[PDB]
Scaffold this active site. Structure first.
Site, PDB file in Angstrom:
ATOM      1  CG  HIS A 110      -0.349   5.496  -0.958  1.00  0.00           C
ATOM      2  ND1 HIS A 110      -1.541   5.368  -1.649  1.00  0.00           N
ATOM      3  CD2 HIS A 110       0.428   4.428  -1.301  1.00  0.00           C
ATOM      4  CE1 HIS A 110      -1.502   4.262  -2.382  1.00  0.00           C
ATOM      5  NE2 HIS A 110      -0.328   3.701  -2.169  1.00  0.00           N
ATOM      6  CD  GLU A 120       7.410  -0.296   1.800  1.00  0.00           C
ATOM      7  OE1 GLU A 120       6.272  -0.412   1.376  1.00  0.00           O
ATOM      8  OE2 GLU A 120       8.214   0.585   1.466  1.00  0.00           O
TER       9      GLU A 120
END
Length: 108
Positions: free
Chosen positions: A100, A71
């Site tokens: 998120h 990520e």
């Protein structure tokens, strides 16, 4: 810088790496980054957190091998981290999240 969805997406697909403005959380911690103080900009001007392994323990992303998902923070400039992330596989599938890691949608 390159910290937009498209920019990092296009950049990874090519060069096969994140651009020079990314640092992993451990690297950031060593420079004095304190998540609770949201000071990344002060300790590493122009950098964003990126390159760390994403576990995918919830299988919210296509199943891949152990350390194939990574990520990177998107749209970060200063202060506390935001909710924007890019998810890239070892086979270069590119996904995004703006909530998120709750939900993901394909971008490349």
């Amino acid at each position: 810088v390159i910290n937009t969805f498209d920019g990092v997406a296009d950049y990874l697909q090519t060069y096969h790496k994140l651009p020079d403005n990314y640092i992993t959380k451990s690297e950031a911690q060593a420079l004095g980054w304190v998540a609770s103080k949201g000071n990344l900009a002060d300790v590493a001007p122009g950098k964003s957190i990126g390159g760390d392994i994403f576990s995918n323990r919830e299988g919210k992303l296509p199943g891949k091998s152990g350390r194939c998902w990574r990520e990177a923070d998107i749209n970060y400039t200063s202060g506390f981290r935001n909710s924007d992330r890019i998810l890239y596989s070892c086979d270069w599938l590119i996904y995004k999240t703006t909530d998120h890691y709750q939900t993901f949608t394909k971008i490349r």
